[PDB]
């Protein structure tokens, strides 16, 4: 009955493609062709954070738009003060092979993962003064490529063994495991309401999970190579996925397909990080070509360039209040733009 | 700056701690260990003293080798192999007894990798005795259909080494090959001397004199 099941799957895929095509009556560009462009966005490095000595692989902003945790292959996760370029914490990691870091929305905890297959949760507001590992979540068979805090208690982690798992940091057990990816899951972003999240896997597919039910809802397959980054629109009804195909695309959750693709002819390096502005008009994309291009998310043209990085930018994140955008690169430099 | 003078003091304290930690951690010779499954990686890592990534740090003649046996990551290499650049060398183990085409493909993938265009490979050929016994039992033409020549242990080993060392194309890197039987203590001096040569070459390149 395997052949019958394969035929059913193929015809269901054809039906899904037909439905997505029928839902398309006008693209994004034809609707945003009558609005004024944002113009050239001149963005200057206001602060530069020189604390790391190895390639910075991830960074996350505090919910108060002031603190920033930065994780590098140096084996450290320095928590930064963006306004006063100070360092408030320097947490030595057990495993120096770190590929992700998260800052809890309450600010009490900092997660961290990598090639050790284990997400390490750190307690910043400890009575003893120091930062101590409150939990080490060990349930993955592959490198943990992303981890995002739902709240102080539960964290969703994306791993390199084709699985995303929702955890319970109090008891250290997988509350839910999300399966369905056919390759490494190298990116993850939780919705503003944190009731659902998307992941961008390295099989050129991005799936839409919801943590409560624990099952995938929609899959968006538009890319031609591994998806290296993903980020929700602030409305929570869209997200943009940046791939190694040197293109980042805007997907609409309700329309269930692409909206626009952000590519330029002289761009060949693959995306490493995609982030949005507070209003969602600017889509800042990090490139392996040492530059971050600021894309007019509605006009799909380069509104500016964030030049000044001597190596591939590995992470980019806009503050929750939209004041600044911070970029980390492989030259161990974290730069705050505004 | 009223009591932020205490905050700047703390920031400078942990900044000097970061600097000291980086100085201490730059003294270590990082080595990446690859090779096919059951290719003697465990045998050499358990003979040079001391689930996903297994680091075996040890000291030999004042060189702190940090050897990363990353064979436990059964996933796509391309997504995490870029974090292993700036490694001093890539130790490559090959099972001469078993499992040669896969090793050749892996060596071609890793020697022409975009991040390892300068990182030289210390190539190991373990199970020499088993290879010789198998040659005495079975011809070496089984592995290589286009192999023409004498069927002795020395010529077969030389042909295998030539096939492995012909996979590189960057003139800035060299492949150091060795013969091992796994019943030896000479699998560490070879690594040490190859690493010294790589260190002097990288120092000369950094100065621009090379």
């Amino acid at each position, epitope marked *: 009955e395997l052949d019958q099941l394969r035929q059913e799957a193929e015809q269901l895929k054809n039906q899904i493609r037909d439905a997505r095509k029928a839902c398309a009556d006008a693209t994004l560009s034809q609707i945003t062709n009558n609005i004024d462009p944002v113009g050239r966005i001149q963005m200057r490095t206001r602060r530069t954070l020189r604390g790391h000595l190895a390639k910075i692989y991830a960074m996350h902003w505090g919910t108060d738009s002031r603190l920033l945790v930065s994780a590098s292959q140096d084996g450290k996760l320095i928590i930064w003060d963006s306004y006063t370029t*100070n360092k408030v914490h320097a947490i030595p990691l057990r495993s120096s092979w770190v590929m992700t870091c998260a800052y809890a929305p309450s600010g009490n905890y900092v997660a961290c993962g990598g090639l050790d297959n284990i997400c390490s949760i750190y307690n910043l507001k400890t*009575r003893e003064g120091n930062v101590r590992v409150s939990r080490e979540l060990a349930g993955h068979t592959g490198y943990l490529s992303c981890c995002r805090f739902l709240d102080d208690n539960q964290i969703v982690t994306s791993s390199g063994d084709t699985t995303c798992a929702l955890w319970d940091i109090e008891t250290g057990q997988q509350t839910t495991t999300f399966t369905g990816h056919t390759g490494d899951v190298m990116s993850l972003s939780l919705a503003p309401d944190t009731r659902l999240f998307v992941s961008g896997a390295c099989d050129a597919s991005a799936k839409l999970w919801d943590v409560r039910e624990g099952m995938c809802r929609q899959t968006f397959t538009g890319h031609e190579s591994d998806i290296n980054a993903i980020c929700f629109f602030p409305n929570g009804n869209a997200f943009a996925t940046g791939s190694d195909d040197a293109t980042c695309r805007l997907f609409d959750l309700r329309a269930d397909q692409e909206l626009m693709t952000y590519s330029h002819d002289n761009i060949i390096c693959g995306i490493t990080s995609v982030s949005f502005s507070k209003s969602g008009r600017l889509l800042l994309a990090g490139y392996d070509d040492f530059n971050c291009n600021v894309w007019d998310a509605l006009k799909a043209d380069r509104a500016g360039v964030l030049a000044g990085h001597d190596n591939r930018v590995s992470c980019l994140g806009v503050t929750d209040d939209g004041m600044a955008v911070a970029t980390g690169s492989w030259d161990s430099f974290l730069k705050i733009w505004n | 700056s*009223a*009591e932020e*003078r205490a*905050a700047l*003091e*703390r920031s400078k*304290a942990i900044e000097k701690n970061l600097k000291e930690d980086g100085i201490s951690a730059a003294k270590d010779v990082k080595l990446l260990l690859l090779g096919a499954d059951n290719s003697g990686k465990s045998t050499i890592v358990k003979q040079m003293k001391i689930t996903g990534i297994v680091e075996t740090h040890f000291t030999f003649k004042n060189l702190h080798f940090r050897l990363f046996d990353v064979g436990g990551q059964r996933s796509e290499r391309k997504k995490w192999i870029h974090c292993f650049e700036d490694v001093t060398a890539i130790i490559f183990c090959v099972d001469l007894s078993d499992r040669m085409h896969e090793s050749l493909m892996l060596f071609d993938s890793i020697c022409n990798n975009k991040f390892f265009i300068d990182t030289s490979i210390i190539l190991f050929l373990n199970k020499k005795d088993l290879f010789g016994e198998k040659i005495k039992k079975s011809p070496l033409t089984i592995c290589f259909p286009e192999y023409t020549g004498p069927n002795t242990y020395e010529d077969a080993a030389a042909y295998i080494q030539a096939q492995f060392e012909s996979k590189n194309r960057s003139p800035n890197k060299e492949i150091y090959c060795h013969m091992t039987c796994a019943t030896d203590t000479n699998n560490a001096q070879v690594i040490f001397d190859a690493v010294t040569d790589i260190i002097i070459a990288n120092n000369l390149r950094g100065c621009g004199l090379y």
Partner: single-chain antibody
Amino acid sequence: DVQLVESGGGLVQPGGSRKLSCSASGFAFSSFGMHWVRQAPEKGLEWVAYISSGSGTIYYADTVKGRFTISRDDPKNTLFLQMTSLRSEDTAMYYCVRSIYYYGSSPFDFWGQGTTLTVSGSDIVMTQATSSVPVTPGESVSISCRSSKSLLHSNGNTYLYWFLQRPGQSPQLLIYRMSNLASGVPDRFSGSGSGTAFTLTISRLEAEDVGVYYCMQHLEYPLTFGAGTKLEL
């Protein structure tokens, strides 16, 4: 748990010397800037000295400079306050206070127990108008404390602290930076103010909340305590 036990206090003849040691355990003493706060038998608190993390910066009061010295022993987890030429006005009960400083930190959060020591112009003048209030459980009480200078710094943070010294106990930080409630303090305690005039409001006052409330600024060393408003049952 976190424990700051100090000893070395007793009857000292005038003109003598005495060393106080503050044994610390349960926390990372190395990264904490440690203070010394004294309290005369009939007066309020009065800041004495301060040694920062890493023994970098040391401060003293006007009546302390030269006479005292503050040292710490990070490997031994002990803080020393060597005193020289102890006058008759140096009698007090010297407390040990840990005040780690970073963005969002909670300075003065834990206080030692104290050792009684029975000895035989540009500063911020912070005065509390009322020195005692009669209150009843279940009622709301507000304590005020006016400052000479504006404590609202240009960075948006006003540096006013509120401490409660229950009878027979050590002060416990209640409100730090004039609006933030310290960890472990019940939510019924609230603080407010504007630049110079500050007030702390307590809702549903309980029998365990009776004591003497002190107001403190941290804008500049030396640090001036309030007279101390005492609320009795």
